[model samples]
Target: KKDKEIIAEYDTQVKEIRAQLTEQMKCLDQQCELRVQLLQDLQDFFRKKAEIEMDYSRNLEKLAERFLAKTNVLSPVNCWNLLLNQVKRESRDHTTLSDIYLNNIIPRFVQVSEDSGRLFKKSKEVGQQLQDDLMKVLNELYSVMKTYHMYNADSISAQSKLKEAEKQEEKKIEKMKEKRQAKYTENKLKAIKARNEYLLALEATNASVFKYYIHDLSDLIDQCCDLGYHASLNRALRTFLSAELNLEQSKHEGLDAIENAVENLDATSDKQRLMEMYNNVFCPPMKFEFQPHMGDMASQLCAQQPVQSELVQRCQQLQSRLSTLKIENEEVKKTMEATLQTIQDIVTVEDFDVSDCFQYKPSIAKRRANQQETEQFYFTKMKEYLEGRNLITKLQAKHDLLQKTLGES
Candidate 1:
């Protein structure tokens, strides 16, 4: 009986040791599995990050290409058109230049410059007043754009750092997993079970990150995408301002020199020369702001060149014609019908006017000169406003791009 008991005790001891060894193997397997899964998660995140980076770089290249394509697109005329259109659109909301003009501003300005025969003088006073009101809007827009650009830049920086950090973290996890796996290299079943469980846990963590954190970052990037475009525009504005100031100074000096020279000339033919100077110096092509970079801009087929003098002349002519037509309403009406038919015929050939797209039709009614002037001005301003709205749409697209760049990081 004593011998039987001893043998039974030994058997029990063997079973207990076997169970202990099994559990240790199981524990090691679990550790190895966890480590492997962590590595895989880290790898996937980093890989996706790399892809996002590539996409961002590609987008940036596209932006740069566009900038190169239209680097010379900057001009006072185009910029003014942009501003005018913005004003016209915002005028509806009573927030911009047109709004102010509509609401007692024109009368106030006319009173201030009532004695001024010079259009330039009158326009300057209006511009100065408009500047005061418009500054706040422009400043706010600039700040927003600048801030967004900075944030996007910072995000890109962060992405680079995060990738490195992820790599380091993964390496550490790999080391730990390797040590644990080595302990149970001879125990296949335990190692397999441990790895499977680890992978499941790792997947859960990844899903959580993607659903909650990564998505939040993406949202942020989407929001900040316009920063770069805003920055670019601000840069252009600053450059334009510098040029305007220089042009103003030179204009003053040149006019003084010309007037002095004119005073010295006694011949009527000499007076004709002065008048010719005025014609050549004031005409659209002749009076062109000698932008050294104009040719560069012109080379870019897509770059917009606005002839400020021509537009002004067109407006002035339209204003004058309208006024004369009103004095003789019936005569004007007859002329207008003839002009309309002529314009239509030309449009059929060249398709120059897209006015019909907006469902606008020309009227043949004659009225007072002032009424005609007002109508022409209205149409001109409306066209300008539509163009400005289109610019805003392009800006929105740029903004979207900036936001995407920011969030990806």
Candidate 2:
């Protein structure tokens, strides 16, 4: 009986422990199921958020790249601001949705629907702000386009007026041309008449001067011979005889008489018989008489042609010097001009620089300085050549005058 009682007490104790354990296990299972449900719901929310974030990043990247690649009309800073604003705008709704989960739903899952409603409201506000900003830009663009169209229309109207004015001016110019043509024709005839009259007067004056010159020359020759200027008289006589011979060759009428008169004339005699015959024959219309005393003729003739040989020699030397200077000047000018041309070619060679060449100075500043030096040298040489040329011209003029006055004989 005692053993049975002990065994029963132990069985009772085991059964009580089993019942408590079962009750505790049932409560634990309920708590664990609730915790797993919350954790799974949180995991699902995070998974969905990660997916949205990934999509947003890809979309933003694609859109931003496209925008940047296609249109860079704005400056870099403004373009960055614009792109930032665009990205902000694109993510505004996403941020609002994420805020619903992070700030409201994640904190209190029971308020998820309410947070989503608030997100919708905020998203609408962001969209409205975006639309307002975009509309502002659109209005500005429209105004600018409208102003451009107005200006273009005005330009077209002005062009039409200008064309009309040009046509009227063309008509006026044509009328003026007709008047000018008529006036030109009248002036042309007057100019021709004046030219003919002037030519006639010039011809008469030339003939009168030539006749006087011939008369004076015969008298001057007679005076020189009477003065016993043997050398001077011989030279002058040879020059006069040569001119007469040329005229005689050209079939001139009375030059033969002048030649015959001087051909055998004595250089020491004061007799004027040959010259008198020449004057009477050559100038039948105006026979001028020439009379001179031998002593006075000698004194005056010496004064007239003093230092004859020295003057002639000095003039010949000057002519040779002038010829030499001219040749030297021409050669110098050619050299200077060639230098200037080389400088021009260098400067005009389309971005030419010494750096482009080997074994030379490379600095642009040094090259530019070299160019200036070269140009200055060329101009200096040109100035020198020009001054020399002017001096040579004056010397040539003096030589020609000496030849004309003294005669080459």
lDDT value, residue 120 of candidate 1: 32
* Cα error, candidate 1, residue 377 (Å): 12
Candidate 2 versus truth, CA RMSD in Å, comes to: 60.5
The residue-level lDDT of candidate 2 at 333 comes to 86
- Could you give candidate 1's per-residue lDDT for residues 143-189 as a string of tens digits? 34334444444544555655565576653565554543343343444
How does candidate 2 score on lDDT? 0.55
Q: What lDDT does each candidate get?
A: 0.44, 0.55
**Alpha-carbon RMSD, candidate 1:** 42.2
Model 1 stretches with alpha carbons more than 4 Å out: 72-409
TM-scores of all candidate predictions against the true structure: 0.20, 0.24
For candidate 2, write residues 1-409 as lDDT tens digits. Answer: 3424644654575467446535643553464355446545764775588468557856876776676676512233343555444564545445444445454444444333343344444534543454344334323433343344444444445555545655766635655545444544555555555546545644654554354336543443344234333443355346435644653454333334334444434443423544554675656474544566764553222315557877678787887798789889988889888988989887667564677577655698898888888988898998998889788877887787677668554
Cα-based lDDT at residue 103, candidate 1: 34
Off by over 4 Å in 2: 1-304, 351-362
